[PDB]
Amino acid sequence: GLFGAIAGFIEGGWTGMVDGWYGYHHQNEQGSGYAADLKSTQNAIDGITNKVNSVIEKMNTQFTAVGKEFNHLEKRIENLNKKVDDGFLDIWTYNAELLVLLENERTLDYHDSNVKNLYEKVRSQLKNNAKEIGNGCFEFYHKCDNTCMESVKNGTYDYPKYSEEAKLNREEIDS
Amino acid sequence: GLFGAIAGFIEGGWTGMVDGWYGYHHQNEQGSGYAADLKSTQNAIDGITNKVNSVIEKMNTQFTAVGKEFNHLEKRIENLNKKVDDGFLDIWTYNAELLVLLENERTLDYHDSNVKNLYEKVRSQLKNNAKEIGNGCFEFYHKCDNTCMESVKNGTYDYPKYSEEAKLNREEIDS
Amino acid sequence: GLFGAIAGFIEGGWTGMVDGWYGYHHQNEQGSGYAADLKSTQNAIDGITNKVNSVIEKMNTQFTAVGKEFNHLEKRIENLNKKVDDGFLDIWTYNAELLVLLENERTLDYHDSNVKNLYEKVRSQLKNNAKEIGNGCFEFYHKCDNTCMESVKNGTYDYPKYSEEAKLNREEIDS
Amino acid sequence: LGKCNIAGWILGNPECESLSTASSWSYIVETPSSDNGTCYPGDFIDYEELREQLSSVSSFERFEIFPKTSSWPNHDSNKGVTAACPHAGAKSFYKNLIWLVKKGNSYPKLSKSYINDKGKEVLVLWGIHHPSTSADQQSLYQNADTYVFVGGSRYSKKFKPEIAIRPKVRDQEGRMNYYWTLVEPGDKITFEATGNLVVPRYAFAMERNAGSGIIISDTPVHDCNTTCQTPKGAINTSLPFQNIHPITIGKCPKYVKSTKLRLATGLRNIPS
Numbered sequence: 037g038l039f040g041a042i043a044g045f046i047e048g049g050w051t052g053m054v055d056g057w058y059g060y061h062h063q064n065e066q067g068s069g070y071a072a073d074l075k076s077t078q079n080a081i082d083g084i085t086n087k088v089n090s091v092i093e094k095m096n097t098q099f100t101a102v103g104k105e106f107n108h109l110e111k112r113i114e115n116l117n118k119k120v121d122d123g124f125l126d127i128w129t130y131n132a133e134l135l136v137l138l139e140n141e142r143t144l145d146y147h148d149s150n151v152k153n154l155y156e157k158v159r160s161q162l163k164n165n166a167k168e169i170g171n172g173c174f175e176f177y178h179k180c181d182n183t184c185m186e187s188v189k190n191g192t193y194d195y196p197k198y199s200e201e202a203k204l205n206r207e208e209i210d211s
Numbered sequence: 212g213l214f215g216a217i218a219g220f221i222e223g224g225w226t227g228m229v230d231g232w233y234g235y236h237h238q239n240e241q242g243s244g245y246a247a248d249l250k251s252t253q254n255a256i257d258g259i260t261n262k263v264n265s266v267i268e269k270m271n272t273q274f275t276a277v278g279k280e281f282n283h284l285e286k287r288i289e290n291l292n293k294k295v296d297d298g299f300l301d302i303w304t305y306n307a308e309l310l311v312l313l314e315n316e317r318t319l320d321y322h323d324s325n326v327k328n329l330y331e332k333v334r335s336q337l338k339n340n341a342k343e344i345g346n347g348c349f350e351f352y353h354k355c356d357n358t359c360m361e362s363v364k365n366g367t368y369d370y371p372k373y374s375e376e377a378k379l380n381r382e383e384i385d386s
Numbered sequence: 387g388l389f390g391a392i393a394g395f396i397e398g399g400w401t402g403m404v405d406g407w408y409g410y411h412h413q414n415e416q417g418s419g420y421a422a423d424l425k426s427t428q429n430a431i432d433g434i435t436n437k438v439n440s441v442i443e444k445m446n447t448q449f450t451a452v453g454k455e456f457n458h459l460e461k462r463i464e465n466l467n468k469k470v471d472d473g474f475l476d477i478w479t480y481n482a483e484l485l486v487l488l489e490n491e492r493t494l495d496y497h498d499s500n501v502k503n504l505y506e507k508v509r510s511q512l513k514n515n516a517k518e519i520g521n522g523c524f525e526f527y528h529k530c531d532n533t534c535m536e537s538v539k540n541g542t543y544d545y546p547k548y549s550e551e552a553k554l555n556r557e558e559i560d561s
Numbered sequence: 562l563g564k565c566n567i568a569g570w571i572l573g574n575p576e577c578e579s580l581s582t583a584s585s586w587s588y589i590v591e592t593p594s595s596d597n598g599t600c601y602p603g604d605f606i607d608y609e610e611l612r613e614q615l616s617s618v619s620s621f622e623r624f625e626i627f628p629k630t631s632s633w634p635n636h637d638s639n640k641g642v643t644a645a646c647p648h649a650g651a652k653s654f655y656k657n658l659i660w661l662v663k664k665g666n667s668y669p670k671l672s673k674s675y676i677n678d679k680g681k682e683v684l685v686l687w688g689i690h691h692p693s694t695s696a697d698q699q700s701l702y703q704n705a706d707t708y709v710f711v712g713g714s715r716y717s718k719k720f721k722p723e724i725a726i727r728p729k730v731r732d733q734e735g736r737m738n739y740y741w742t743l744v745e746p747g748d749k750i751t752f753e754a755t756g757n758l759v760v761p762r763y764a765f766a767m768e769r770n771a772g773s774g775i776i777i778s779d780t781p782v783h784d785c786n787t788t789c790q791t792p793k794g795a796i797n798t799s800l801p802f803q804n805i806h807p808i809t810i811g812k813c814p815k816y817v818k819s820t821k822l823r824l825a826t827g828l829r830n831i832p833s
């Protein structure tokens with residue numbers, strides 16, 4: 037992947053998470069489960085929807101009858117007509133094929149970028165209060181209940197609130 | 212430069228490095244020399260190759276004879292033919308000139324971006340185990356043999372393995 | 387912004403600085419005021435001037451008379467002439483509209499990049515001898531007179547000359 | 562041309578000015594109300610082609626190719642006037658043509674030739690008259706079965722008058738067709754007729770340019786130079802695009818439908 041998250045340091049996808057494209061798995065004393073980050077998912081769904089509509093709706097054609105009829109003494113203009121139909125066929129086929137090829141690659145990179153930014157948003161929030169244990173997972177140095185978990189997902193994690201407890205537990209763990 | 216690396220905080224290029232576009236100079240107790248980061252170079256070479264082929268291969272023309280012949284009482288259609296040839300000439304010339312101008316700028320910015328990301332990948336790996344001494348160079352606070360050097364280039368540098376020795380040497384150096 | 391400086395971590399522009407596009411505000415014991423970094427401004431003015439001339443001067447047309455006259459039994463070639471004039475009108479209008487849209491975005495990103503590189507050039511010069519207090523401002527840990535200020539703007543700031551005094555003041559401030 | 566179109570000006574319509582001195586022009590201006598042209602109804606053959614060929618000329622000299630007083634001793638060169646082409650209320654005709662009619666009761670076979678010794682191309686125009694009735698044919702030309710022949714090293718056409726009553730246009734039930742050809746230097750043009758020939762009187766020595774065009778507009782003419790002209794007015798710009806008029810003459814910016822093409826040069830403006 038272009039950004040390294042999908043099929044990268046996050047190795048696989050979650051069939052268990054069904055309500056969103058990008059989300060979270062959590063586990064605390066209150067239990068575990070999957071949840072989807074609604075903001076990032078809806079932003080990506082809006083973006084891709086706009087992309088598909090842009091590809092479709094920018095093609096606005098008028099009423100037209102492609103066919104033409106020529107008699108046996110009009111072979112040259114008949115071939116001229118064929119060249120026009122063929123040239124348009126070649127232009128549209130090649131352009132359509134490459135547009136799908138190139139934009140499909142951009143779409144997968146887009147998802148890869150969205151995952152990386154989501155991981156980095158959390159990592160920049162938790163800082164040293166949690167450990168980066170790989171596969172997109174953070175292991176906390178302080179207890180993080182459901183309310184604390186939602187604050188991380190909401191982008192409102194209070195680092196100073198838990199920094200002292202995490203610091204003491206981190207030093208004890210490392211010692 | 213748009214990203215600040217080329218002709219920026221890395222002032223010049225290396226004629227001594229001949230096997231790649233972006234790479235490393237190293238110096239340890241075992242010696243010194245130039246080496247090229249193969250992954251970043253091959254990715255950039257693949258990217259630029261695709262760019263050049265895209266510019267060339269998207270132009271697919273058919274068989275065509277531009278010339279037309281008109282008699283002395285057909286001056287108006289002769290001039291109409293000239294307007295068509297001239298209009299196509301103006302459109303293609305202007306578009307070709309600007310395409311090369313704009314995409315050349317994008318290409319140099321691309322190289323600038325690739326260098327900056329390469330520098331930042333190393334800096335984020337070494338953290339405080341080395342000092343940023345300018346010109347894209349890192350001076351280590353711990354001995355980094357050939358194996359250690361390759362780990363940095365391979366993106367597998369073990370920061371905790373050397374963190375204690377670097378910390379002791381850093382504090383001694385700063386004291 | 388694409389680079390984060392303009393309308394980013396540097397929130398607003400300076401009406402007080404009138405002699406340049408990118409510059410400095412300084413304040414020391416000798417006073418305060420605005421000054422413009424001449425090198426970065428002149429480089430950007432040269433760059434944008436070349437961009438505008440490139441857009442204008444690559445259009446080189448010849449002498450031409452667009453008009454054509456057809457009698458009442460020449461409707462088909464009259465419509466053919468109209469198709470040529472209309473097709474050229476559609477091609478030039480669409481290309482002109484998108485060229486201005488796309489290159490205007492590139493121009494604002496260019497200014498954003500120039501500001502970021504200017505900020506980063508200073509930050510990489512001062513290192514720990516000053517504190518990053520936000521909004522593009524550096525607060526020094528050692529007295530920096532007018533001569534010292536000009537050295538920073540000239541890219542000749544002598545970090546070792548003040549490193550000891552800044553280190554002592556930094557540790558005292560942090561204690 | 563003002564009151565006249567190219568047909569009236571090049572034929573000598575009575576309501577049109579005449580160029581005596583050798584002249585040149587970079588393009589031609591008609592007004593939307595220039596409605597004089599061929600005051601005797603008929604068809605001007607390859608009229609649009611002639612307009613294109615005259616749009617710009619380096620040199621242009623009118624000369625009396627067949628002088629009126631000496632070229633037609635056996636034909637009447639004074640009665641060929643009509644109420645379709647009035648001058649000051651009296652019957653008249655085109656200045657550059659002479660409507661030859663029978664002298665007395667005889668119209669002998671006509672034969673007149675001109676050799677181009679002007680060193681440049683000569684534009685020669687002539688007309689063929691198609692009367693409304695057999696009475697009208699004989700009252701003008703005395704001969705019932707007539708022909709016209711015009712021949713050059715490259716031109717060769719035989720004309721046969723077509724007599725019938727057409728709907729009145731400018732009180733004329735007959736018709737007159739107008740023809741032109743360019744005689745190259747050193748070539749001869751021959752006229753032959755037993756009637757119905759509207760002979761040239763004034764021809765035009767000229768040198769064509771690379772073709773300009775024709776502007777039909779009411780915009781006045783002033784002593785400004787310009788390098789790009791439109792029917793609305795002249796354009797002085799180095800900018801690559803314009804939205805004033807799609808039909809222009811000269812080295813001009815490309816025409817676009819855009820109302821605003823503003824290119825950013827400075828920064829995003831964020832005061833306070």
Ligand SMILES: *[C@@H]1O[C@H](CO)[C@@H](O[C@@H]2O[C@H](CO)[C@@H](O[C@@H]3O[C@H](CO)[C@@H](O)[C@H](O)[C@@H]3O)[C@H](O)[C@H]2NC(C)=O)[C@H](O)[C@H]1NC(C)=O
Pocket residue numbers: 574575576596597598599600645646647731
């Ligand atoms: C030069 O151009 C002017 C027009 O710009 C010509 O004047 C027009 O002459 C026609 C002649 O057929 C007039 O129309 C006729 O008017 C009478 C009386 O109203 C009517 O009986 C007919 O049925 C027909 O409508 C027209 O009014 C007149 N226009 C003006 C503005 O005076 C003029 O004849 C041209 N001269 C030459 C030598 O080409």
Ligand SMILES: *[C@@H]1O[C@H](CO)[C@@H](O)[C@H](O)[C@H]1NC(C)=O
Pocket residue numbers: 784785786
């Ligand atoms: C136009 O240019 C010609 C040729 O140089 C010159 O004679 C004339 O005065 C110019 N007219 C104006 C209005 O500048």
